[PDB]
Design a protein around this ligand. Structure first.
Ligand SMILES: O=C1N=c2ccc3ncsc3c2=C1CNc1ccc(S(=O)(=O)Nc2ccccn2)cc1
Length: 262
């Protein structure tokens, strides 16, 4: 409990900004279910990585690092991304996922909403409120947690699921970067859950627009066979990531996004 211790929209609490007095760093400060809070700070403090929004301190308040580029959601809903930019974002997210999975942590809520962007093009992950710390003795989980449209079918059907569900969600995020929305978004969340259960691997509106390499990456991200689905370390070696652009190539997207949402 106590043991470990304005850009605000209502959200699930509010957000503000500030500056470091001594070093000058700019920081962002977040201001129902406290047990999840305990899990969240514990997981955040011991899992620092360049591709994760780093947790600074706590006081309920939470101080974490500053990224002024916004979230990937504004980019995917207001801009058109090309395969190079998508590959760069996917590589950053896969690096974060490899780091977490090597530490036996499953995010379970990967989506464009939980990706933050720096003005330099930095791609980072956040929102650990839905973590799953697994172990050799208990390495699977059946709780139906996450956001419906991004949830893997094995999670939806409450089967035994592992870290690769994150991979599935990453694939859904890739569809976001292609079409602007995850599959079934016009449907309500419950019908969306049923459609994920009954259809399986989602179909793209216009797959013809994609290179065979990108289709291959998606097919290895959205494979129903968990053994056949790729791990983060396996996917980091995919040829798709070879056509990745420099992160500095996301700065225009960010610039476009802020123009669109103003
Ligand atoms: O840098 C950040 N680290 C964060 C960690 C968690 C978190 N949770 C919600 S936001 C956030 C974090 C940020 C930055 N968040 C952010 C929010 C809005 C914008 S913005 O493009 O919309 N600019 C602004 C600025 C003031 C008021 C409203 N919007 C930019 C970054």
């Amino acid at each position: 409990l106590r043991s470990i211790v304005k850009i605000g929209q209502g959200a699930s609490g509010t957000v503000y900004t500030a500056m470091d007095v001594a070093t000058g760093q700019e920081v962002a400060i977040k201001q129902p279910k406290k047990e999840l809070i305990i899990n969240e700070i514990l997981v955040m403090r011991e899992n620092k990585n360049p591709n994760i929004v780093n947790y600074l301190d706590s006081y309920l308040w939470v101080v974490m690092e500053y990224l002024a580029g916004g979230s990937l959601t504004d980019v995917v809903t207001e801009t058109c991304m090309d395969e190079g930019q998508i590959a760069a974002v996917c590589r950053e997210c896969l690096q974060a996922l490899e780091f977490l999975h090597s530490n036996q942590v499953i995010h379970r809520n990967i989506k464009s909403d939980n990706i933050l962007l720096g003005m330099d093009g930095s791609v980072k992950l956040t929102d650990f409120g839905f973590c799953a710390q697994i172990t050799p003795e208990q390495s699977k989980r059946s709780t139906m947690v996450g956001t419906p449209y991004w949830m893997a079918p094995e999670v939806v059907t409450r089967k035994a699921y592992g870290p690769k569900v994150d991979i599935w969600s990453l694939g859904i995020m890739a569809i976001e970067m292609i079409e602007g929305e995850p599959p079934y978004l016009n449907e309500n969340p419950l019908r969306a859950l049923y459609l994920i259960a009954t259809n399986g691997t989602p179909e793209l509106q216009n797959p013809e627009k994609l290179s065979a390499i990108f289709r291959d990456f998606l097919n290895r991200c959205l494979e129903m066979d968990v053994e056949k689905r790729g791990s983060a370390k396996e996917l980091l070696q995919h040829q798709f990531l070879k056509i990745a652009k420099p992160l500095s190539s996301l700065t225009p997207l960010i610039a476009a996004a802020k123009e669109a949402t103003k």
